[PDB]
Amino acid sequence: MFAIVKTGGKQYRVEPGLKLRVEKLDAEPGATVELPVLLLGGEKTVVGTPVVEGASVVAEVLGHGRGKKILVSKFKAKVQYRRKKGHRQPYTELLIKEIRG
């Protein structure tokens, strides 16, 4: 039994036990959150329209992190334009606990 959830403007296939890094959630570590459900699959197949009404995915927030640094660098030739920016995308790491429905 898996579920297609939506968080951070993206969608994910989750199953209980799965560790998932998502866009940063405003939630203290240790807490639990309920994710919207777009689809259920495995033994039952229930299709959200767009999200199925009674369903949620319980996920424990393991904690919040910052991604490995990406160097975003801009260069324009013959114009002496150079920009060096370090980006570290913030994220939340979730432990998928259970799929309700």
């Binding site: 197949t45 767009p50 660098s73």
Partner: protein, 116 residues
């Protein structure tokens, strides 16, 4: 007082050479050639970060389209189907379903067909 270059320029040059590790020939050995390679490298990364989002979507779309034609329709009809149905599963997850969960994908085709 006198503030000669001393230690500084070498260190900046090392920062750049290290970034250029792996590059061919002087592009990893010459500070200048390394510098230049990195300019291109930096823009390419930027361009391709943006272009990756497009690449994967086009990949998903081809996979979805193949899976659709197995069930008698094409991609465009199917997507109009999910739309009219108000099914919002994205191409990333649609494509996963089309490979890992053919039965679930089959269901969505039905709904898509039904919606029009």
């Amino acid at each position: 007082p006198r503030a000669k270059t001393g230690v500084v320029r070498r260190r900046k040059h090392k920062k750049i050479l290290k970034l250029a590790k792996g590059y061919w020939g002087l592009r990893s050995k010459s500070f200048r050639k390394a510098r230049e390679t990195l300019f291109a490298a930096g823009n390419y990364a930027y361009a391709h970060r943006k272009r990756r989002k497009r690449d994967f979507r086009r990949l998903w779309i081809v996979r979805i389209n193949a899976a659709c034609r197995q069930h008698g329709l094409n991609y465009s009809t199917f997507i109009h189907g999910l739309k009219k149905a108000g099914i919002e599963v994205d191409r990333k997850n649609l494509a996963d379903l089309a490979v890992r969960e053919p039965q679930v994908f089959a269901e969505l085709v039905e709904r898509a067909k039904a919606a029009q």
